[model samples]
Target chain A: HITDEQVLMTPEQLKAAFPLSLQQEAQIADSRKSISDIIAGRDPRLLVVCGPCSIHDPETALEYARRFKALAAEVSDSLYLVMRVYFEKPGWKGLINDPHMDGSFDVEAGLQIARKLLLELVNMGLPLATEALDPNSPQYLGDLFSWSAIGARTTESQTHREMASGLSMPVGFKNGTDGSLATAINAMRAAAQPHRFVGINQAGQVALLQTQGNPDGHVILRGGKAPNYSPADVAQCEKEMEQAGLRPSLMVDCSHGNSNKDYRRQPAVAESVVAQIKDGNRSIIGLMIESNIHEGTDACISWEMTDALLREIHQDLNGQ
Target chain B: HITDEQVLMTPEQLKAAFPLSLQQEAQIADSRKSISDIIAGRDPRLLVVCGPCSIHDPETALEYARRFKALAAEVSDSLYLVMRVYFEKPGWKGLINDPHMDGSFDVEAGLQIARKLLLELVNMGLPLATEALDPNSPQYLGDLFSWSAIGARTTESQTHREMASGLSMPVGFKNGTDGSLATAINAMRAAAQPHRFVGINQAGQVALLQTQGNPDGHVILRGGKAPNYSPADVAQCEKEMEQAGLRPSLMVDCSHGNSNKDYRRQPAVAESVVAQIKDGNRSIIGLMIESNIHEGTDACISWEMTDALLREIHQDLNGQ
Candidate 1:
């Protein structure tokens, strides 16, 4: 049935091209083992992902971490506090566009600043996590991260699934922006199987990628355009996971659809989730919230410079 | 065509129901006039809207503004710097929502913060502007603002138009989040006429409101789901404004839509917009760019302790 050009001399092509170094594969195995064990309840610890909505500068980040690290130490009894060192923000609306984990990301200064700040956060004994918006992004800076999230925007992207298959951490896939459970399941399925694809590597070079896939993959239900996570929804999701033959670890994002994007309702959602957890809801392991220093938002009208053009200078800052 | 029931004249009925005062309206008018005169080329200084995005704690706002005021005086020659005193965040995914502009509509805190921050900015010779998200939000805070913006999220909203019609400063309408342009024009037109609507007064009584609408309103292109305002897009937008018989005063928000949701693209977008201005694009009169201490975004994950949860926080302090 096969064409002459594609003759089936081999049932599968394991090494058609790019293969990981023996050492790199070992690193990946070690990481996946650690995270998988933790999620499987082999370790008794609540994962804590915390940080700014986005990281623009390292000085403020270091300062923020200095404050959080102290609190993390205090809560080490039941939690594994992870500093959310997110460098890529997925706000399709555009208010803030951070490009921290990107390579050739245009802002050499941000790149340098990112590396330095991450080292500081790690040195402070903090574990790190972030969203991998760009598949190419992690090649330059993925080493510093321990956990990765595939956001709603790209949870269904084949490119993202491929990236996850090769990543060295536990990966959490958010429901689609419109809140599709099927999409998250598909991502999980794809990432859990072995994969061979195209991607960039550590030295910033494009190459073929292969991995046994991420069995540590999980799901995070951040409410959507329609609020769907009642107890019934959670039970249904768990049933779906069982049917798919996947593990049952899940997280609930309290923002977005759950609060209807309303910041005030976040607490009630959190309370509801915690109640569910307390009463033995095992499918939902965590939640996400969008609280800030200020509870609300403001607007900037037509603003002009305080200094004349001769007095002010603005400049990588641009990446695709 | 007036029906007896609809147009029935009843002095006693009106008096019994129309309890809100005209003092708030008067205050709003005075504020609008002061700002309009400045933007109509009457004032030679730039209007700089500065402040923490919103104040949960009036003390920190005061602290931040004290520094803003000091810097304001040093650059008064080129700027009419105004501290942004935004109070309410109206997230309309449709549920019980945001804190009222007055922190429960109690004019004391908002007015105090607005005036305190504004007076300091003014004392240091700066101008002030904020988004009038709530129609009545202007009453508590409008008095101290020199300029004002109708936020994009709400610019398409009819209630916002009615509020903008009576606002004190030269109002600007932001394009809708998905990049709709006509909505902003409609808002400007609505704000340029006289109207009556329902609202509350200083004494917190409900009443009918009337206003002479704004005539100095303009449009801001904040990009969209994808970038608009390329040379071609801007030209098409200018033609659209002309067709509508509106004076097309345009501003490019370097922060939001223009960057394809990438912060790094901000500087390039800013420079390109500047080029458009230098090319004698009269339509571009003002520009809005979100620049904090650094220029990027972060994760929305909060790191609040039980102590920090009920307390006010500004997650946007570092990112916005």
Candidate 2:
């Protein structure tokens, strides 16, 4: 039984409430093209999607973004830095699901807060990345994201696959929880075809979404049962992609299974992937690191460590 | 690139186009309660969800509904029959994706056709059951369904679980593709709790949905690597449910893996399930059979055979 129903502001309404400046929109458009070029092999810069795993406070997120924007400029020559601004997760939900951190799930307030943060971040001339967990949230905040990801838990879901097909950003599908690449490969193939599914328009009205299919979908190997960032794993993935008749483009998450759930190990994983790039691996286009202002027990790297790793990655790519 | 974006009618507009009579609405409400009663163990009658696997032609669907309505009245005392009005599938996408069975995906037209058929069926005093595949389609057609199912492929999906939490009818979560019940059990638990996700209101504008969890979610053992409708399988399911602290209410899907992809074996599977019920199994609450007008290579039981099987099931219940 649905206990309650309330109408929140539509995407159009939310955008109006926290409007994106023309300059910000142009910045987003430019970032989207740059990211797409990287995925499509047109750009040689490494795409680094780094930020807090989940934003608990908008102010903290903005502070991190401000710092990230400066680092992004410093590494603009060899690294395409996109701040990860995820707002949704599985168990605890995320910022958009429960903004106040209390039991009161002020989703409307959360949406407003999230949009305001995104607008501010984009206005700072930074490209953004997020996990597109809630399909409907994309309409409200998708315009701000240059890259989006389908998490391991939802990589096989047709709903998410269909959602990815219509998304304007270059979407990354993670491998299954058991370290299977077939599902992510299948998702990439599925998302590249046209689809007509049900969704809402900008007005918040339910409409049939007929998508021309997203051509820029790539695989992100975040490890499954075991670490899959090894050179043999990369070769296996390349062979699988060739067999599946798909473009051999992939991203590596230095967190998650690759880091064995330990944030400190992320740099080691990142270095290993960088070694693969140094060895002439062209399919590995990007890397993801979960980073925040400070980290203790949480599964996120520290901002200080993240800065060093980015510089290290820049040096590795320059050496290549 | 999303090459085309079109705004179809809102749920409000679609309902207005094919308005439900007060009597029809009342009928729907009554049937929903009846199905809920069956699932909750308040009703002693067997709940039977029988219809085509997927409805491509509205005329064919209505004709099947007309015949099913007459047969439903015959088994009203012993069995609660709901017409399965599915309009989506995986590969072909279904009626809503391509209404004309051609590449021209006239989704606007498909919604009207689907809604028109649902209204007609409800007017005929038949409760409807559908596979709630597309998260958005439920907004347009969910009001008419007495029962909805989250398919095996999507049972583990957080998006589908969230969708089930907000659905206004009794929802069933099927076992995973490899016959794993943990995912389905986990899905039931997830759906039974409150959820706040993004969706559209009746106005078709995107809004955040806050749901008070659906209590009527049960597991449907559709089998996976092997058939799971045997007595031992039911016992295993009941024990697992007890361990998970959920009410031991379950449904057996006689098609798919249970029938080993052979629709002809569905009756034998149904008989085995009825045998379990006759042996004092109160946990076994319902059964689902895919039936269509005519069946050959397709994985659906024939209409003539479905009629006879229903009568046999009724007799089996009466003898008990």
Best by TM-score: 2
Give a tens-digit lDDT track for model 2, residues A177-252.
9999999999999999999898899999999999989999889988988999999999999899989998899999
Best by lDDT: 2
**Leading candidate by DockQ:** 1
User: Every model's DockQ, to 2 decimals?
Assistant: 0.01, 0.00
Candidate 1 yields a Cα-based lDDT of 0.58
Could you tell me which 10 consecutive residues in candidate 1 chain B have the lowest summed lDDT?
A: B311-320
Ten-residue stretch with the least lDDT total in model 1 chain A: A309-318
**Model 2 chain B poorest ten-residue lDDT run:** B89-98
Candidate 2: how large is its RMSD?
Answer: 27.8
Clashing pairs in 2: A204-B204, A204-B205, A204-B206, A205-B204, A205-B205, A206-B204
* Candidate 2 overall lDDT versus native: 0.86
Backbone clashes under 3 angstroms, per model: 32, 6
In candidate 1, what are the lDDT values of residues B207-235, reduced to their tens digit?
78888887877777777787776777788
